[PDB]
Design a protein around this ligand. Structure first.
Ligand SMILES: [Zn+2]
Length: 256
């Protein structure tokens, strides 16, 4: 198989006698195929930055081993040269401490795997507008990716109602330094949706939110060029192309 860097892929395997799916020594979790009871699924994601050129997964069964080969593709992402080197920025210590604490909190949240579905059918787009900044727009330094857009931006004047893309449990609902006012929803199976730069948060941590319920109002909080909604998906441990992910997920789980 082939997969563009920064995208997720739903791998299908036989359920019977399956033991484990591994990438080197890393275990990849599995979940049931919703329609074919003889099948299970796993989400494999390639990091946008510095991906391997190829990946070989091993599915271990009771009586056989299967190999899955995935070639990394570069895709057709927008890219331009970094005007100034991404040097060490030098924030005040109080800001450095906040950034580090919020990184630690986020890592803990994305490492807390929910082994059941919290979603309800297909994902919906969180608002009815249009993309203003595509996922995966990159800035390069000596033809090495220095930074990239890790979600997708939608046009939104400040105060635009934002709705949960799918049902789940709220894991972040607060102001963070870079993301601004942030909502992150766990959908199960290591799938998280992200809503950043909000002007108002209308949910609390731990809340079971239903698809299409209001989560807040769009804004321009945090690090932003102006008002908009930033929408992201983390799945298979990595930020992935969110609309591409929604299409692939919906092809499997839409109800039906
Ligand atoms: Zn963005």
């Amino acid at each position: 198989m082939e997969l563009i860097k920064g995208q997720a892929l739903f791998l299908e395997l036989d359920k019977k006698d399956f033991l484990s799916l591994k990438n080197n020594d890393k275990n990849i979790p599995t979940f049931a195929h919703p329609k074919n009871q003889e099948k299970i699924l796993a989400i494999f994601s390639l990091p946008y930055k510095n991906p391997p050129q190829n990946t070989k997964l091993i599915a271990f069964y009771k009586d056989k081993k299967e190999e899955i080969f995935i070639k990394t593709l570069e895709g057709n992402y927008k890219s331009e040269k970094l005007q100034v080197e991404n040097k060490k920025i030098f924030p005040p210590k109080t800001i450095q401490e906040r950034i580090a604490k919020e990184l630690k909190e986020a890592n803990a949240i994305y490492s807390s795997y929910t082994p059941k579905a919290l979603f309800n059918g297909a994902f919906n787009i969180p608002l009815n507008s249009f993309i203003t900044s595509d996922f995966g727009k990159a800035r390069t330094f000596n033809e090495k990716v220095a930074s990239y857009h890790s979600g997708t931006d939608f046009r939104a004047a400040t105060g635009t109602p934002i709705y949960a893309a799918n049902s789940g449990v709220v894991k972040i609902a607060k102001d963070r330094y870079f993301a601004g006012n942030s909502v992150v929803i766990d959908h199960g199976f290591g799938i998280y949706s992200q809503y950043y730069h909000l002007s108002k948060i209308d949910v609390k941590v731990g809340q079971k939110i239903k698809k299409g319920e209001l989560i807040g109002l769009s804004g321009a909080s945090g690090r932003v060029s102006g008002p908009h909604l930033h929408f992201g998906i983390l799945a298979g441990g990595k930020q992935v192309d969110p609309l591409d992910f929604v299409s692939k997920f919906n092809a499997i789980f839409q109800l039906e």
